[PDB]
Amino acid sequence: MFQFLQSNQESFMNGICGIMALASAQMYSSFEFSCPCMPEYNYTYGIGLLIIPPIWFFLLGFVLNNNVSVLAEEWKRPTGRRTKDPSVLRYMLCSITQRSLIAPAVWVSVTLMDGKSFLCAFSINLDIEKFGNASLVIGMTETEKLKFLARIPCKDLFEDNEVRVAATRYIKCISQACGWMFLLMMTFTAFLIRAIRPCFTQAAFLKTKYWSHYIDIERKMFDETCKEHAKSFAKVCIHQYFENISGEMQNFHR
Amino acid sequence: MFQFLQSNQESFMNGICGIMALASAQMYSSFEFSCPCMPEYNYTYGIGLLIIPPIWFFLLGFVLNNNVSVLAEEWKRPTGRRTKDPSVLRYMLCSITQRSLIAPAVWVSVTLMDGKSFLCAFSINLDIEKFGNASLVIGMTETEKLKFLARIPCKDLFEDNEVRVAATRYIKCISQACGWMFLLMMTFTAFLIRAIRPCFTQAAFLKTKYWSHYIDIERKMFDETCKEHAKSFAKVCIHQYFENISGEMQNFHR
Amino acid sequence: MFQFLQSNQESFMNGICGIMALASAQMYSSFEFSCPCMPEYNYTYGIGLLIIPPIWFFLLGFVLNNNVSVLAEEWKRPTGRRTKDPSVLRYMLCSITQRSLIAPAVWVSVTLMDGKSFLCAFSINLDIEKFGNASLVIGMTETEKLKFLARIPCKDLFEDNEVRVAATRYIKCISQACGWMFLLMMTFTAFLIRAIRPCFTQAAFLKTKYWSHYIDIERKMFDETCKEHAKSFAKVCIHQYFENISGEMQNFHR
Amino acid sequence: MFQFLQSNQESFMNGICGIMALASAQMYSSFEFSCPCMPEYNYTYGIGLLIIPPIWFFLLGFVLNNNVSVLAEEWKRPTGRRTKDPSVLRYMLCSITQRSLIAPAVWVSVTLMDGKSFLCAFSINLDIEKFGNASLVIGMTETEKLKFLARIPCKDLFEDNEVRVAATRYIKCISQACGWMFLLMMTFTAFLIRAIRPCFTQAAFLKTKYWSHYIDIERKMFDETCKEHAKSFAKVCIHQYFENISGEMQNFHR
Amino acid sequence: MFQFLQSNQESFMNGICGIMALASAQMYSSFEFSCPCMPEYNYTYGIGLLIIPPIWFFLLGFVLNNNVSVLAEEWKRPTGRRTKDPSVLRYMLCSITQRSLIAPAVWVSVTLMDGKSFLCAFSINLDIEKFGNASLVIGMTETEKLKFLARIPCKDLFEDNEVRVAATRYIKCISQACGWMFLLMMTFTAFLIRAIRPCFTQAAFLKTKYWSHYIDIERKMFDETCKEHAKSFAKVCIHQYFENISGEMQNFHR
Amino acid sequence: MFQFLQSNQESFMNGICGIMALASAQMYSSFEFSCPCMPEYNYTYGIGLLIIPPIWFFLLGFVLNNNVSVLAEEWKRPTGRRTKDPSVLRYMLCSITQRSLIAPAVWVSVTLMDGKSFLCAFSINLDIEKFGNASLVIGMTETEKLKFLARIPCKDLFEDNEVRVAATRYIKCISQACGWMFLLMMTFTAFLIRAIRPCFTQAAFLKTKYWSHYIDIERKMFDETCKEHAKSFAKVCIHQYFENISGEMQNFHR
Amino acid sequence: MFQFLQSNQESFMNGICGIMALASAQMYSSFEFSCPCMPEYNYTYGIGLLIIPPIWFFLLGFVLNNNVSVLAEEWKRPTGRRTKDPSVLRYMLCSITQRSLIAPAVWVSVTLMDGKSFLCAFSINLDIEKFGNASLVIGMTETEKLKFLARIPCKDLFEDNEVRVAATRYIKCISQACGWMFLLMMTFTAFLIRAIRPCFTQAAFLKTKYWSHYIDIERKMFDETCKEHAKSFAKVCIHQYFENISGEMQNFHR
Amino acid sequence: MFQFLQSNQESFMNGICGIMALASAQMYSSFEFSCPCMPEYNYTYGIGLLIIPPIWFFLLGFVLNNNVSVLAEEWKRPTGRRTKDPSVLRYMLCSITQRSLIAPAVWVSVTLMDGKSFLCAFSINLDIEKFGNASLVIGMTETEKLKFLARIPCKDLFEDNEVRVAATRYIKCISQACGWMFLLMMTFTAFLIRAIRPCFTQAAFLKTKYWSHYIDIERKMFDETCKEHAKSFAKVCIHQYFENISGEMQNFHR
Incomplete structure (x- = not known):
C-alpha cells in the first residue's frame, strides 16, 4: 500500500508522519x-517484538522532529525568563507526541494482523487436544510437552503439519481480532481528539502555529543572511588574490 | 483496477474518497x-470480517475529514450563538457521511465477490449429501460432523478435495449473488439520492458550499499571515545578531 | 487493450465513457x-452474469453523470414553469442513455467471447454422445446425468478430460459466434444512429450543447465567486485576530 | 510491434487509422x-473468423469517423439544395472507405500468418497418408475419419502427435503463403492508388480538404461561442444570487 | 537492438527508413x-521467405513515401509541359529507391544470420553420412530418404537428435557465412555510392533538395490557408445562428 | 527501504549522510x-564483520566531507595565527564526527538483525543438548566437537538439519535482541544530544554555520572568477589566431 | 554496460562512435x-568471426560518417584546383579512420573475452591427454580423432562432459589472456596517440576543425535558404489557387 | 549499487571518475x-586478473582525461620556453594520477570480496586434511595431488562437494579479509592525502585550477569562433548559389 501517497505527495497534512508510517510497515x-x-524465550521474543519496536519508532519521531530542541530550550529556562505561556508549551509537546504515535500504531497493527508475535508468544499456552491427535502429548513430561508446543511457530521443527496448521489458524484468528479491536479503539480515540479538543484548546493552537511558522522563517532567514555576509568577504578575498597572481599570469598565460 | 485514477487524477469530484476506496480494496x-x-469461531470470524472493517473505514472517513471539528464546534455552541442555520449543519453532516460510506461499500463488495467470508461463516450450515459421498458424515456424532464441516474453508485441513471444491463453489456462487445484489441496491440508492435530493435540498447546498470554501480560504490566509508576521520579527532578530557577531567576524574572517 | 487510450488521452470524444468501458472489461x-x-443453479448463475452486471454498469453511468440531477430538476417542475422545450429534455435524456450503454456492451461482449457464461448455463442442455464415450450416461438416472453434465464447467469436478474439452470447445464456439453477432448488430445500430439521427434531430443538438456548456460554466463561476466572497470576510477575521494577539506577541516574540 | 508508433506519435498521417490497426492486431x-x-462446424468457425471480424472493423471505421454524419446529411438533401459537387461527395466517401480498410487488412494478415483459421477450416480436407501411419484411417467409416481429421486443430483431442505436427506445419505453410500473397496484392493496390489516382482526382482532393478543415473549425468555434454566451448569462445569475444571500452572510459569517 | 534509436531520435538522417528497418527486424x-x-515444398518455403518479404518491404517503402505521387505526376505529363529536368526526376527516383532498400536488406540479413531459411531449403541436399550413423539411409528408397532429410528442420518430426544437431550447425554456419558476405557487399556498395556519386551527381542533388523542401512547404501552407478561409466563413455561420437562437435563449436561460 | 528518500530528495537535512546510510545497507x-x-577463525570472521566495516564507513565519512581539510589547516596553524576560536573548531569536528557515525550505525544494525555474524562467531559456544539428539557429541573429542559446532553456520557442511535450524533460530533471536537494544540506545543517545546540546552549545553553532556557508561561497566565487579571467585571455588568443589563419582561409574557403 | 552513456548522453566527445561501440557489443x-x-570448417568459422565482423564495422564507420564524400570530392580534384593543403586532407582521413576503429576493437574484445571463437578454431589443436581419460583417442584413426576433437565446442555433440569442461576452461583462459593483452596494447596505443600526436600535428587540427564546422554550417544554412525560397513561391501558388476556388466557395460554403 | 549516483548526478565532485568506478565494477x-x-596456470590466471585489469583501468583514466595532451605539450617544450612553473606541472600530473586510481581500486576490491582470484591462485597451496577425508590424497603422486587440488575452483571438475565447499569458504574468508584490509589502507591513505596535502600544496592548487578552467574556456571559445567565421563564408556561398539557380527556378517552379 505504498504507491498511493508515493504518487500523491499532496494528500498529506504532515509529511514526516506519512513517511515514517510507510517506513514502519516496510x-x-x-x-x-x-x-x-524454546519455551523459555518464546514469550519475551513474541511480546518484545510487539513492545520494543513501537518504543523505538516513538523516540525516532522525537529525534526527527526539529522543534524538540527549541521546546527543550524553553522548558530549561526559568519562569519569568520564559517568553511563552505554559499552555503553548503543553500544546506544542502534545502536537509532537501525537504525530510520533503514528509509526508505533502502524507497527502494532501490522504485527497483530500478521499473527506471528501471538503465535510465538502463546503457543505453549495451547490446549493441543483441540487440534489433532490426542495421543501426541501423552507419554510426555510436563517439561517435554512445553518443548513440543514451543516448536509450533517453526515449520521445520514441528512435524505434524495438521496440528500445526490448525493451531496457527486459531492463534492468527485471535491476533487479527486483537488487531481489528486495536485499530478500532485507536481510530475512535483519533475521532474524539479531532472533535472535542479543537473545541477546547483554541488560540493555543493559533499561538503554536505562529511559533512553528516563526521557526521555519528564522532558520531560513539566518541561512541567507549568512550567505550574503559571506559573499561580501569572499569577494574581498578572491579579488585580492588575483591582484598578485594575475601579475604572474601575465607571463604565465600570455 | 488501480492504474485508472492513478494515471487520471482528473476524473475525480472528491479526492480523498477515491483514495480511500482504492485503499479499502488494496x-x-x-x-x-x-x-x-473451528465450529465455535467460524461464524464470528467470517461475519466479523464483513462488519468490523466497514465500521473502521467509516470512522476513518470522519477522522480524515477536516470539517468535522468545525462542525463539532458549531453543534457544541448554544442556540442563538450558532452562526449557522440547522439545515446547513444537517446538510454538512449528511455530506461528510455520504462520502465516508464509499470505502465501507468497497470492502463489503470485494468481500462478497471473493466469497471467503461466506465460506468461513456458513460451512457448518451445509448439507453435505449434495456434494459428494454420503458415507462421509455417517459414523460421526453431531459434534464431530460440525468439526468436519468447519474445516471446509481450509485446504490443508480438509482431505476430500472433491467435496471441498463442490462446497466452495456453491457458497462462492451465493456470495457473488449477494455481492451483485448489494452493488445493485447501493447504486440504485445512489441514483435516487443524486436525482431526488438536489430537487429538495437546494440553497442549503449553496450555503454549505460557501462554508467549505470559506474554511479553505481561512486556513490558508491564516498560514500566510503568520508567515509575514514572522518575517517582520525574524528580520529584526537576525540583523541584531549580526550587529555584534560581525564585530567579531572582522578579525575572524579577514 | 488498455495502454492505447491510457497513453493517448486525446482520441476520446467523451472521457468518462472510455474510462467505464475500460473499467468494465478490467x-x-x-x-x-x-x-x-449444480443443475439447479447453473442457468441462473451463467445467465445472471450476462444480465445483472450490465444493468449495474448502466445505472452507474447515470450515477456518475452530473447532468442527471439538472434534468431531473427540469422534469419535476410543472409545464409552463419549465424553461426548456420537451424536445431538448428528450434529446438530453437520449444523450445520457447512449453513453451509459457502452460499459454494458463491453461486458456482454467480453462475457460471450470468453465463453464461461454459456458453458455454465448450457452444459445440462448438451447431448453428450457427440463428445466421447456413449457408455458415460448409460446406467444413470435422468437426475444423475443432469448432475453429471452440470459438472462440465468445473475441471476439478469432471473426470473425463476428453469429453470435457470437446464440450467446452463446442459451447465456446457458439458463445463466440453470439459475441460476434452481438458486436456486429450493436455496431450497425451505432452506424444508423450516427448517420440518420443527426439528419433528423438538429438544433435540439445545438440547444443541448449550449445547455451542457452552460452547466459547466455555472458550476465553475459559482465556485470562484464563493472563493472571492470568502477572501473578503476571511481577510477581515484574520487581521482582526492579529490586532490583539500581536499585542501579546510583543513580549512573546521580542 | 506496438512501441514504434506508441513512442513516435509523429510518423502518422492519420491517427485513428494507426490506432485501429494497432487495436485490430492486439x-x-x-x-x-x-x-x-467437429466436422460440421470447423469450416464456418475458421472461415468466419477470417470474414466476420474484418466486416466489424470496417463498420467500426465508419462509426468512429466524425464526417460520416455530415456526408449523410449532404446525400439526403435533394439535388439543387446540395451545396457540394457530386465529385466532392464521391471523393469524401472514398477517403473514409480507404482509411476504414486498414484494420480489416491487419486482421486478415495476422490471421493468415498465424495459421489457425486454415487449420480449423481445412483439416477435414487433408489426405492423411502424407503425414504418418497409413493404418490410421483404415478400419474407419467415411463419417468416422471426418471426425478423426476434424480433431487435428486440438492438441488435447488428437492423440498422434507426429501426424498432428506434420499436418499443422503443412497447413500453416499454405496459410503463410496466402498471407504473403495477400500482403503483396494489397500493398501493390496501395501503390497504384497512391500513384495513379492523385494524377486523376485533383481539386476534388483540394475541395475535400477544405471541407474537412471547415468542419473542424465550425465545431470548435461553435464550442467556444456557446461558452462565451454561457459566461454572460452565468455571471448574471451568480451575481444576482449573492445579492440576497450575502444579505444573510452578514450575520452568518461576521 | 531497438532502444538505441528509440532513446536517441537524433542520430537519424531520415526517420522513416530507421523505423522501417526496426520494423523489418521486429x-x-x-x-x-x-x-x-516435406521434400516438395521445403525449397519454395525457405527461399520464398528470403525473397518475398524483401519485395514487400520494398513496395512498402514506395507506398509510405509521400513524394512518389508528385514524381508520378511529373512523369505522366508530356515533354515540354514538364517543369523539371530529366536528371532531377532520375535523381529523385534514385533517392526514393535507395531508402526503400534498407528494410529489405535488414530482412535478408536477419534471415541469413538466423539460419532457418537455409535449413528448410537445403536439408534435402545434405549428404547425411557426414553427420552420424551411416545405417540411417540404407534400407530406404531414394523417395523415402528425401522424406527423411526433409524433416531435419523439425525437432518434433526428426528423431535422431545427434544427426539433427550436427546438420543444423553445418547449415547455419553456411547461412551465417552468406549473411556476413551479404552485409559486407552491401556496405561496400554503400561506401562506393556515398563516395563516388556525390562527386558526379551534384546540383541535381541541390535541385532535388529544393524540390523536397518546396513540397513540405506547399502542403503545410495549403493546410493553414484552408484553416484561415474556414475561420472567416465559420465565424459568419456561428454568429448568424445565435442571432435567432439567443432570441429564444432570452426566455430559455433567464 | 530505498525508494523513500530516492523518490523524496527533500526530507533530508544533509544529503551525503542519507546516501551513505543507504549505501551502507546496500x-x-x-x-x-x-x-x-572452522573453530579457529569463526570468531574473528564474525566479529570482524561487525567491527571492521563500521571503522571503514567512519573513515569514509571523513574522506568524503569537504571541510576536513579546512579544519586540518586551522589546527595545524599556531595559536595566535588561528582566526577561529577553539570552541568553533571543537564544534566543527563534533559536527563532522556525528554525521560520520550514521553509516557505521546502519551497518551494525543490519548485521545484528540478520544474525549471521553472531551465528558464525558464537556457534562453538553452544550447548548442543538444548537443540536435538544428545548422542551427537558423545563419542567425539573436545577438539572434534569444536569442529562439529563450527560447521553450524554452513548448511552444506552440517548434516543434521533439525539441530542446525534450532541453533540458528536461537542465535538469531539473541542477535535481534542485541540489534533492538543497539537501536534503542543509539536513538536515545540521539535524543539527548538533540535536546541538551543545543541548550548548551549555542553561538558556536551559529559561528560554525557561518563558517560552512563561507566555504561554499568562497569555492564557488573562486570558480567563476577563474572563468572570467580565462575568458579575457582566451578571447585574446583566439582572435589573434584567426588574424593569420583567416589570411589563409581567404584562398582556402573562397 | 549500456545504461551508463544511455542515461548520460553528456560524457561523450563524439556521439556516433559511442553508439557504434554499444551496437557492436549488443x-x-x-x-x-x-x-x-567439423574439422574442416571450425578454424575458418572461429577465426572468421574474429576477422570479418571487424572489417564490416570499420566500413560501416566510413559509410555513416558524413565527411567522407566531401573528402572524396577534394581528393578527386586535381592539384592546383584543390582548396586544401595535403596535410589537412591527411589529418581529416586519419580522424575518420581512428573513430572508425572503436567498434572493431569492441568486437574483438568481446569475442576474446567470451572465448567461443578460440574454442571453435583451436579444439582440434588440443592434446586431449591433459584433460581426462587417456583411453578416449586410442582405437581411433588420426581422421577420427580430428572429428572427435572438433565436437568439443558443441555440448550436445560431445558426450564426455568432464573432458569438455576441462578443455573449454583451458581455451577460454587463453582467449581471455589474449583479450586482456589486446585491450592493453590498444589502450597503450591510444595513450601514445593522444600524447605525442597533438605535440606534432597542430594547426592541421585547427584547420580540420574549421573545416568540420564549415560543413555543418553550410548544410544547415542551405536547408533554411531552400525553405525561405520555397515559402516565397508557395505563398504565390496558394493565394492564386484560392482566387478562383473561393469564387466557387461563395455558393459552396455560404 | 548503481542507482545511487545514477539517480543523483549531483553528489559528484568529478564525473568521469564516478562513471569509471561504476564501469569497473559492472x-x-x-x-x-x-x-x-590446471596447476601450471591457476596462479597466473588468478593473480593476473587481480593485476592486469587494474593496469588497464589506470591507463584508461589517462586516455579519457583531456588534459594529458596539454600537459605532455608543456613537458616536451624546453626550459625557458615553458610558460608554467614545475610545481604546477607536478601538481597537475598528481591530480590526473589520483583520479585515475579509483577504477583500479574498485576492481581490486570487488575481486577480493568475491574471492575467486584467491580460490584459483591458491588452491594448490591448500593442506587438504583440514577439510574432509584424509584418504583423498593418499595413493596419489605429488604431481597427481597438485592436479587434484587445482580442480577445487571448478564445481563440475571436483567431485567431493564437502571438501570443495569447505576449502572455498576458507579461501574466500581470507580473500575478504584482504579486501577489507585493502579498503581500510586505501581509505586511510585517502584521509591523509585530503588532510595533510592541502596544508602543503596550496596556490599550486589555485594555479592548476585556473589552468583547468582556462582549457575548457579556450576549447569552447575556439568552437564558437570557428562557427561564426563559418557563417560569414557560408552565407556568401549559399546566396551566390541561388543567384544563378533561382534564374532557373523561375521557369522550373512557376
Missing part, C-alpha cells in the same frame, strides 16, 4: 521473524 | 484471511 | 467466475 | 481461438 | 517460421 | 557472507 | 554462435 | 571467471 516486511521455538 | 488484497476452521 | 478480468456446477 | 492476440473440432 | 522476430518438412 | 546486501566454518 | 550478444563442429 | 560482473583448473 521495516516489518523486511524484518525476518525468528521465533526461538 | 487492504483487502493484503489481508491474509485466516479462518479458524 | 472488472471482467478481476472477477473469479465460480460456476456452481 | 484484439487478435487477446482472442482465444477455440476451434469446435 | 517482424522477423514475430514471424513464426513453419517449415513444411 | 553494501550489506551485496556482501556474500562466507563463514569459514 | 550485436555480439544477439549473434547466435554456431560452430560447425 | 565489468567485473559481466566478466565470466574461467579458472583453468
Whole structure:
C-alpha cells in the first residue's frame, strides 16, 4: 500500500508522519521473524517484538522532529525568563507526541494482523487436544510437552503439519481480532481528539502555529543572511588574490 | 483496477474518497484471511470480517475529514450563538457521511465477490449429501460432523478435495449473488439520492458550499499571515545578531 | 487493450465513457467466475452474469453523470414553469442513455467471447454422445446425468478430460459466434444512429450543447465567486485576530 | 510491434487509422481461438473468423469517423439544395472507405500468418497418408475419419502427435503463403492508388480538404461561442444570487 | 537492438527508413517460421521467405513515401509541359529507391544470420553420412530418404537428435557465412555510392533538395490557408445562428 | 527501504549522510557472507564483520566531507595565527564526527538483525543438548566437537538439519535482541544530544554555520572568477589566431 | 554496460562512435554462435568471426560518417584546383579512420573475452591427454580423432562432459589472456596517440576543425535558404489557387 | 549499487571518475571467471586478473582525461620556453594520477570480496586434511595431488562437494579479509592525502585550477569562433548559389 501517497505527495497534512508510517510497515516486511521455538524465550521474543519496536519508532519521531530542541530550550529556562505561556508549551509537546504515535500504531497493527508475535508468544499456552491427535502429548513430561508446543511457530521443527496448521489458524484468528479491536479503539480515540479538543484548546493552537511558522522563517532567514555576509568577504578575498597572481599570469598565460 | 485514477487524477469530484476506496480494496488484497476452521469461531470470524472493517473505514472517513471539528464546534455552541442555520449543519453532516460510506461499500463488495467470508461463516450450515459421498458424515456424532464441516474453508485441513471444491463453489456462487445484489441496491440508492435530493435540498447546498470554501480560504490566509508576521520579527532578530557577531567576524574572517 | 487510450488521452470524444468501458472489461478480468456446477443453479448463475452486471454498469453511468440531477430538476417542475422545450429534455435524456450503454456492451461482449457464461448455463442442455464415450450416461438416472453434465464447467469436478474439452470447445464456439453477432448488430445500430439521427434531430443538438456548456460554466463561476466572497470576510477575521494577539506577541516574540 | 508508433506519435498521417490497426492486431492476440473440432462446424468457425471480424472493423471505421454524419446529411438533401459537387461527395466517401480498410487488412494478415483459421477450416480436407501411419484411417467409416481429421486443430483431442505436427506445419505453410500473397496484392493496390489516382482526382482532393478543415473549425468555434454566451448569462445569475444571500452572510459569517 | 534509436531520435538522417528497418527486424522476430518438412515444398518455403518479404518491404517503402505521387505526376505529363529536368526526376527516383532498400536488406540479413531459411531449403541436399550413423539411409528408397532429410528442420518430426544437431550447425554456419558476405557487399556498395556519386551527381542533388523542401512547404501552407478561409466563413455561420437562437435563449436561460 | 528518500530528495537535512546510510545497507546486501566454518577463525570472521566495516564507513565519512581539510589547516596553524576560536573548531569536528557515525550505525544494525555474524562467531559456544539428539557429541573429542559446532553456520557442511535450524533460530533471536537494544540506545543517545546540546552549545553553532556557508561561497566565487579571467585571455588568443589563419582561409574557403 | 552513456548522453566527445561501440557489443550478444563442429570448417568459422565482423564495422564507420564524400570530392580534384593543403586532407582521413576503429576493437574484445571463437578454431589443436581419460583417442584413426576433437565446442555433440569442461576452461583462459593483452596494447596505443600526436600535428587540427564546422554550417544554412525560397513561391501558388476556388466557395460554403 | 549516483548526478565532485568506478565494477560482473583448473596456470590466471585489469583501468583514466595532451605539450617544450612553473606541472600530473586510481581500486576490491582470484591462485597451496577425508590424497603422486587440488575452483571438475565447499569458504574468508584490509589502507591513505596535502600544496592548487578552467574556456571559445567565421563564408556561398539557380527556378517552379 505504498504507491498511493508515493504518487500523491499532496494528500498529506504532515509529511514526516506519512513517511515514517510507510517506513514502519516496510521495516516489518523486511524484518525476518525468528521465533526461538524454546519455551523459555518464546514469550519475551513474541511480546518484545510487539513492545520494543513501537518504543523505538516513538523516540525516532522525537529525534526527527526539529522543534524538540527549541521546546527543550524553553522548558530549561526559568519562569519569568520564559517568553511563552505554559499552555503553548503543553500544546506544542502534545502536537509532537501525537504525530510520533503514528509509526508505533502502524507497527502494532501490522504485527497483530500478521499473527506471528501471538503465535510465538502463546503457543505453549495451547490446549493441543483441540487440534489433532490426542495421543501426541501423552507419554510426555510436563517439561517435554512445553518443548513440543514451543516448536509450533517453526515449520521445520514441528512435524505434524495438521496440528500445526490448525493451531496457527486459531492463534492468527485471535491476533487479527486483537488487531481489528486495536485499530478500532485507536481510530475512535483519533475521532474524539479531532472533535472535542479543537473545541477546547483554541488560540493555543493559533499561538503554536505562529511559533512553528516563526521557526521555519528564522532558520531560513539566518541561512541567507549568512550567505550574503559571506559573499561580501569572499569577494574581498578572491579579488585580492588575483591582484598578485594575475601579475604572474601575465607571463604565465600570455 | 488501480492504474485508472492513478494515471487520471482528473476524473475525480472528491479526492480523498477515491483514495480511500482504492485503499479499502488494496487492504483487502493484503489481508491474509485466516479462518479458524473451528465450529465455535467460524461464524464470528467470517461475519466479523464483513462488519468490523466497514465500521473502521467509516470512522476513518470522519477522522480524515477536516470539517468535522468545525462542525463539532458549531453543534457544541448554544442556540442563538450558532452562526449557522440547522439545515446547513444537517446538510454538512449528511455530506461528510455520504462520502465516508464509499470505502465501507468497497470492502463489503470485494468481500462478497471473493466469497471467503461466506465460506468461513456458513460451512457448518451445509448439507453435505449434495456434494459428494454420503458415507462421509455417517459414523460421526453431531459434534464431530460440525468439526468436519468447519474445516471446509481450509485446504490443508480438509482431505476430500472433491467435496471441498463442490462446497466452495456453491457458497462462492451465493456470495457473488449477494455481492451483485448489494452493488445493485447501493447504486440504485445512489441514483435516487443524486436525482431526488438536489430537487429538495437546494440553497442549503449553496450555503454549505460557501462554508467549505470559506474554511479553505481561512486556513490558508491564516498560514500566510503568520508567515509575514514572522518575517517582520525574524528580520529584526537576525540583523541584531549580526550587529555584534560581525564585530567579531572582522578579525575572524579577514 | 488498455495502454492505447491510457497513453493517448486525446482520441476520446467523451472521457468518462472510455474510462467505464475500460473499467468494465478490467472488472471482467478481476472477477473469479465460480460456476456452481449444480443443475439447479447453473442457468441462473451463467445467465445472471450476462444480465445483472450490465444493468449495474448502466445505472452507474447515470450515477456518475452530473447532468442527471439538472434534468431531473427540469422534469419535476410543472409545464409552463419549465424553461426548456420537451424536445431538448428528450434529446438530453437520449444523450445520457447512449453513453451509459457502452460499459454494458463491453461486458456482454467480453462475457460471450470468453465463453464461461454459456458453458455454465448450457452444459445440462448438451447431448453428450457427440463428445466421447456413449457408455458415460448409460446406467444413470435422468437426475444423475443432469448432475453429471452440470459438472462440465468445473475441471476439478469432471473426470473425463476428453469429453470435457470437446464440450467446452463446442459451447465456446457458439458463445463466440453470439459475441460476434452481438458486436456486429450493436455496431450497425451505432452506424444508423450516427448517420440518420443527426439528419433528423438538429438544433435540439445545438440547444443541448449550449445547455451542457452552460452547466459547466455555472458550476465553475459559482465556485470562484464563493472563493472571492470568502477572501473578503476571511481577510477581515484574520487581521482582526492579529490586532490583539500581536499585542501579546510583543513580549512573546521580542 | 506496438512501441514504434506508441513512442513516435509523429510518423502518422492519420491517427485513428494507426490506432485501429494497432487495436485490430492486439484484439487478435487477446482472442482465444477455440476451434469446435467437429466436422460440421470447423469450416464456418475458421472461415468466419477470417470474414466476420474484418466486416466489424470496417463498420467500426465508419462509426468512429466524425464526417460520416455530415456526408449523410449532404446525400439526403435533394439535388439543387446540395451545396457540394457530386465529385466532392464521391471523393469524401472514398477517403473514409480507404482509411476504414486498414484494420480489416491487419486482421486478415495476422490471421493468415498465424495459421489457425486454415487449420480449423481445412483439416477435414487433408489426405492423411502424407503425414504418418497409413493404418490410421483404415478400419474407419467415411463419417468416422471426418471426425478423426476434424480433431487435428486440438492438441488435447488428437492423440498422434507426429501426424498432428506434420499436418499443422503443412497447413500453416499454405496459410503463410496466402498471407504473403495477400500482403503483396494489397500493398501493390496501395501503390497504384497512391500513384495513379492523385494524377486523376485533383481539386476534388483540394475541395475535400477544405471541407474537412471547415468542419473542424465550425465545431470548435461553435464550442467556444456557446461558452462565451454561457459566461454572460452565468455571471448574471451568480451575481444576482449573492445579492440576497450575502444579505444573510452578514450575520452568518461576521 | 531497438532502444538505441528509440532513446536517441537524433542520430537519424531520415526517420522513416530507421523505423522501417526496426520494423523489418521486429517482424522477423514475430514471424513464426513453419517449415513444411516435406521434400516438395521445403525449397519454395525457405527461399520464398528470403525473397518475398524483401519485395514487400520494398513496395512498402514506395507506398509510405509521400513524394512518389508528385514524381508520378511529373512523369505522366508530356515533354515540354514538364517543369523539371530529366536528371532531377532520375535523381529523385534514385533517392526514393535507395531508402526503400534498407528494410529489405535488414530482412535478408536477419534471415541469413538466423539460419532457418537455409535449413528448410537445403536439408534435402545434405549428404547425411557426414553427420552420424551411416545405417540411417540404407534400407530406404531414394523417395523415402528425401522424406527423411526433409524433416531435419523439425525437432518434433526428426528423431535422431545427434544427426539433427550436427546438420543444423553445418547449415547455419553456411547461412551465417552468406549473411556476413551479404552485409559486407552491401556496405561496400554503400561506401562506393556515398563516395563516388556525390562527386558526379551534384546540383541535381541541390535541385532535388529544393524540390523536397518546396513540397513540405506547399502542403503545410495549403493546410493553414484552408484553416484561415474556414475561420472567416465559420465565424459568419456561428454568429448568424445565435442571432435567432439567443432570441429564444432570452426566455430559455433567464 | 530505498525508494523513500530516492523518490523524496527533500526530507533530508544533509544529503551525503542519507546516501551513505543507504549505501551502507546496500553494501550489506551485496556482501556474500562466507563463514569459514572452522573453530579457529569463526570468531574473528564474525566479529570482524561487525567491527571492521563500521571503522571503514567512519573513515569514509571523513574522506568524503569537504571541510576536513579546512579544519586540518586551522589546527595545524599556531595559536595566535588561528582566526577561529577553539570552541568553533571543537564544534566543527563534533559536527563532522556525528554525521560520520550514521553509516557505521546502519551497518551494525543490519548485521545484528540478520544474525549471521553472531551465528558464525558464537556457534562453538553452544550447548548442543538444548537443540536435538544428545548422542551427537558423545563419542567425539573436545577438539572434534569444536569442529562439529563450527560447521553450524554452513548448511552444506552440517548434516543434521533439525539441530542446525534450532541453533540458528536461537542465535538469531539473541542477535535481534542485541540489534533492538543497539537501536534503542543509539536513538536515545540521539535524543539527548538533540535536546541538551543545543541548550548548551549555542553561538558556536551559529559561528560554525557561518563558517560552512563561507566555504561554499568562497569555492564557488573562486570558480567563476577563474572563468572570467580565462575568458579575457582566451578571447585574446583566439582572435589573434584567426588574424593569420583567416589570411589563409581567404584562398582556402573562397 | 549500456545504461551508463544511455542515461548520460553528456560524457561523450563524439556521439556516433559511442553508439557504434554499444551496437557492436549488443550485436555480439544477439549473434547466435554456431560452430560447425567439423574439422574442416571450425578454424575458418572461429577465426572468421574474429576477422570479418571487424572489417564490416570499420566500413560501416566510413559509410555513416558524413565527411567522407566531401573528402572524396577534394581528393578527386586535381592539384592546383584543390582548396586544401595535403596535410589537412591527411589529418581529416586519419580522424575518420581512428573513430572508425572503436567498434572493431569492441568486437574483438568481446569475442576474446567470451572465448567461443578460440574454442571453435583451436579444439582440434588440443592434446586431449591433459584433460581426462587417456583411453578416449586410442582405437581411433588420426581422421577420427580430428572429428572427435572438433565436437568439443558443441555440448550436445560431445558426450564426455568432464573432458569438455576441462578443455573449454583451458581455451577460454587463453582467449581471455589474449583479450586482456589486446585491450592493453590498444589502450597503450591510444595513450601514445593522444600524447605525442597533438605535440606534432597542430594547426592541421585547427584547420580540420574549421573545416568540420564549415560543413555543418553550410548544410544547415542551405536547408533554411531552400525553405525561405520555397515559402516565397508557395505563398504565390496558394493565394492564386484560392482566387478562383473561393469564387466557387461563395455558393459552396455560404 | 548503481542507482545511487545514477539517480543523483549531483553528489559528484568529478564525473568521469564516478562513471569509471561504476564501469569497473559492472565489468567485473559481466566478466565470466574461467579458472583453468590446471596447476601450471591457476596462479597466473588468478593473480593476473587481480593485476592486469587494474593496469588497464589506470591507463584508461589517462586516455579519457583531456588534459594529458596539454600537459605532455608543456613537458616536451624546453626550459625557458615553458610558460608554467614545475610545481604546477607536478601538481597537475598528481591530480590526473589520483583520479585515475579509483577504477583500479574498485576492481581490486570487488575481486577480493568475491574471492575467486584467491580460490584459483591458491588452491594448490591448500593442506587438504583440514577439510574432509584424509584418504583423498593418499595413493596419489605429488604431481597427481597438485592436479587434484587445482580442480577445487571448478564445481563440475571436483567431485567431493564437502571438501570443495569447505576449502572455498576458507579461501574466500581470507580473500575478504584482504579486501577489507585493502579498503581500510586505501581509505586511510585517502584521509591523509585530503588532510595533510592541502596544508602543503596550496596556490599550486589555485594555479592548476585556473589552468583547468582556462582549457575548457579556450576549447569552447575556439568552437564558437570557428562557427561564426563559418557563417560569414557560408552565407556568401549559399546566396551566390541561388543567384544563378533561382534564374532557373523561375521557369522550373512557376
